[PDB]
Amino acid sequence: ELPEDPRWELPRDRLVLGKPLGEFGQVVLAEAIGLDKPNRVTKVAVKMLKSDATEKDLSDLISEMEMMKMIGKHKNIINLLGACTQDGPLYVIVEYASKGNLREYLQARRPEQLSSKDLVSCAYQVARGMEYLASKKCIHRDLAARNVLVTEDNVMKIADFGLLPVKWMAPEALFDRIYTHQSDVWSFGVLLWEIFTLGGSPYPGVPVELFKLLKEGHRMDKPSNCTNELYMMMRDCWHAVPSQRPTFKQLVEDLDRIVALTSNQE
Ligand SMILES: CC1(C)Cc2cccc(C(N)=O)c2O1
């Protein structure tokens, strides 16, 4: 049974468990009383084990928690806020994202409507998030709009960074199971694509074939209504040669400038 860690422990009774948010494991909205230090309530997401869950399940949850502990805080990832480890089930508590994941965020604002500059900023923020994770030697393995969540203030937060997704894998990860900062940049390219199709499905019509088509040099076409600059960036992200993809560091610099030049009025 679990060891306490005073750094993160929040007494169980400071948590008012509200409605479910998603579900291997359930996630509930919750209000947490006195998280900073007192009589303030803060809305949060509380991760816990499903009813019939084996010791496999538990162990991973602890791992995720333990991992978030080590990675630390960034504006653009879903942060750890605390946990209830003593005297009842494990509850891991993380920042709450009121607007949901980016896929559904974007789909719901197809013609509410997101400007040109918002769509680039969305990209910048996720890049930053991954830039941070990358600096902390974190390798995501499943970066995608489904796994980026959006808060009440429209701040993009990478999620699940501490745990058909094939359509998001770089080919070397797909074939030889090699994941890296570079394969995560591949995944970012597909995510840039999801952004500027407002949540489009990748490789529509292609059965999972796709192994070979990627080997033959198949790349998604540019979305209707995406600049060529941003299509090239997707294309750079999808380099056949991993060492030849840009890094998140450079991606951030590029999106930064691009954001600055992008029309708010469009
Ligand atoms: C743990 C997780 C990434 C899963 C999940 C589902 C639904 C909402 C949230 C959230 N943190 O707001 C959430 O955080």
Residue 265 domain-assigned?
no
22 is in an annotated binding site: yes
Contact 144, 194 (CB under 8 A): yes
Q: Are residues 9 and 114 in the same domain?
A: no
Q: Are residues 55 and 115 in the same domain?
A: no
The length of the chain is 266
> Which of 96, 115, 141 lies at the terminal end of a domain, its last residue?
96
**Residue 212 CA from chain centroid, whole number:** 28
Whether residues 88 and 111 share a domain: the answer is: no
DSSP-derived 3-state class of residue 140: coil
Domain boundary among 37, 68, 96: 96
Q: Is 44 in the pocket of ligand 1 (CB under 6 A)?
A: no
Q: To one decimal place, what's the resolution in Å?
A: 2.3
CA distance 57 to 77: 23
Q: Is the domain of 73 the same as that of 161?
A: no
Question: 44 CA to middle of ligand 1, Å?
Answer: 9
| Number of domains into which the chain is organized | 2
Q: Is 142 a catalytic residue?
A: yes
Which CATH number is 161's domain given? 1.10.510.10
Q: Which two tokens stand for residue 109?
A: 């604002």
Whole-angstrom distance, CA of residue 87 vs CA of residue 168:
40
What separation in angstroms does the CA of 19 have from each of 30, 101, 108, 150, 202?
Answer: 7, 17, 22, 18, 32
Which residues of the chain come before a gap where C and the next N are over 2.5 Å apart? 23, 37, 111, 163, 208
- Same-domain pairing of 118 and 224: yes
Indicate if 120 and 234 belong to the same structural domain.
yes
User: Residues 207, 121: one domain?
Assistant: yes
Domain span holding position 49? 1-96
Q: DSSP strand E in the chain: where?
A: 15-22, 26-33, 41-48, 80-84, 91-95, 100-101, 148-150, 156-158
Residue nearest to atom 14 of ligand 1 (CA): 45
Report residue 106 as tokens: 């974007």
For residue 46, the domain's CATH number is 3.30.200.20
Kindly state whether residues 131 and 225 are assigned to the same domain. Answer: yes
Place of tokens 């998001």: 168
Nearest to 126 by CA among 107, 108, 147: 147
Experimental technique behind these coordinates: X-ray
80 lines ligand 1 (CB under 6 A): no
Q: How many CA atoms lie within 13 A of 85 on its CB side?
A: 17
Q: Which of 60, 118, 142, 236 is catalytic?
A: 142
159 Cα: distance to centroid of ligand 1 (angstroms): 7
